[PDB]
């Protein structure tokens, strides 16, 4: 049987200087009785970078790694603690068991900056006339500067739910105000676009007392 | 001291083969196993190669189309992926077991060839939003600025998405005062080097 690793929490919103704790639970003991080492390692990974070893054999800090990083645990339960977390520690963290193959990775913990709840400012953009010449229409819904990351964006076409043909992209957390921004893009053939009058994106977010809908009518 | 140097980014069409190299230094190459890991924006272990015998061992999900090999005298491990499919688009890492990871190699599988972007306007309380839709280009990256770098506050350039068409698209947006709409020009500067495309798109109400 394959060793399973469960990592929690999947996300953690931190404040500089706080103690941060994340956990790794394995389905089988990672303790090698022959040398009494636990075959679990912890890594840090920043966006667009490779994983960097923090702690190995469960509790041994890698040389050069700041002493705020501490691993502990044995057998099936492990933890990584950051004693006084720093802005430079914003990153993903994950555990790895290398006791038996296949090697298995925890699902990761993503550290973000905590801030107050912020509702998105919502805007909707019709496709340009220039694009329509191409035979395709892109309709874009922008959710500007919100927190937390969780948000629901529902497209509607002629007042009916449109759940297909859309894709979302999100920015990295803003360096100045710690918010996120998101785009949702609805891609339709010119023919499908011109068959309807009303285009709307309805946004639900913790910061909004009721969902906000931004909409346009073709021809206004 | 320990180093693993991987080959550069790869752009491939479906059905092709890609060969990724991992050049090791700072330790005895043939004493320690090299592992391979796939990452799609979590991590998946692909298997390992015995650097002494050359014998590869593949994880269950990587059994037919994947091949690990060595050029031992060059202290180099290779990963080959054959019959490329869209699901192979990812970053691939070699690793000296759990101890040290290579910098990774990105792979993009697409039916597309080099292609310049089309740039369309995203046309505009007292806050207005405006932007540029940068559509249908290949490969990454593009750069976007606003007013030649003079406008930076409130700018959000979204990460590109690889569309169903095999072409990338992204939007860059900015928020400004509604009252600036009549008193100021907003132009997005889009550069796509692989196609020598440079577009400055003026965005008007």
């Amino acid at each position: 049987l394959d060793i399973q690793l469960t990592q929690s929490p999947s996300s953690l919103a931190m404040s500089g200087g706080q103690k941060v704790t994340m956990r790794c639970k394995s389905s089988q003991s990672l303790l090698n009785s022959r040398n009494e080492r636990n075959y679990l390692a912890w890594y840090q990974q920043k966006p667009g970078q490779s994983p960097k070893l923090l702690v190995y054999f469960a509790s041994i800090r890698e040389s050069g790694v700041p002493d705020r990083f501490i691993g502990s645990g044995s057998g099936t339960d492990f933890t990584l603690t950051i004693s006084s977390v720093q802005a430079e520690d914003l990153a993903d963290y994950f555990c790895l068991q290398h006791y038996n193959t296949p090697w298995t990775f925890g699902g990761g913990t993503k550290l973000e900056i905590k801030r107050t709840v912020a509702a998105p400012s919502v805007f909707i953009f019709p496709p340009s006339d220039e694009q329509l010449k191409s035979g395709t229409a892109s309709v874009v819904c922008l959710l500007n500067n919100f927190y937390p990351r969780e948000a629901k964006v529902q497209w509607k076409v002629d007042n009916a739910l449109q759940s297909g043909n859309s894709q979302e992209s999100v920015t990295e957390q803003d360096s100045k105000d710690s918010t996120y921004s998101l785009s949702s893009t609805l891609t339709l053939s010119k023919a499908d676009y011109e068959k309807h009058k009303v285009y709307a994106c309805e946004v639900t977010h913790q910061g909004l007392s009721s969902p906000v809908t931004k909409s346009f009518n073709r021809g206004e | 001291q320990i180093q693993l140097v991987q080959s550069g980014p790869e752009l491939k069409k479906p059905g092709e083969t890609v060969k990724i190299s991992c050049k090791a230094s700072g330790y005895t190459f043939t004493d320690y196993s090299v592992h391979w890991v796939k990452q799609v924006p979590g991590l998946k272990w692909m298997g390992w190669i015995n650097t002494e015998t050359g014998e590869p061992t593949y994880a269950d999900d990587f059994k037919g189309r994947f091949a690990f090999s060595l050029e031992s005298s060059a202290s180099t491990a290779y990963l080959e992926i054959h019959n490329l499919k869209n699901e192979d688009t990812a970053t691939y890492f070699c690793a000296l077991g759990w101890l040290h990871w290579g910098l990774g190699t990105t792979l993009t599988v697409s039916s597309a060839s080099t292609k310049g972007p089309s740039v369309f306007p995203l046309a505009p309380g007292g806050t207005a939003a405006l932007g540029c839709l940068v559509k249908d280009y290949f490969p990454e990256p593009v750069t976007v600025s606003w007013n030649s770098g003079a406008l930076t506050s409130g700018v959000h350039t979204f990460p590109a998405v690889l569309q169903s068409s095999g072409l990338y698209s992204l939007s860059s947006v900015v928020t400004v005062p509604s009252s600036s709409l009549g008193t100021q020009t907003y132009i997005c500067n889009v550069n796509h080097k692989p196609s020598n495309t440079k577009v400055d798109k003026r965005v008007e109400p």
Binding site: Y56, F57 | T53, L96, W98
Partner: peptide, 16 residues
């Protein structure tokens, strides 16, 4: 000693 033992275990765990 402990230091030598750690190096042994460390590198042995990385063996082919």
């Amino acid at each position: 000693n402990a230091q030598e033992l750690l190096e042994l275990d460390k590198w042995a765990s990385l063996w082919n």
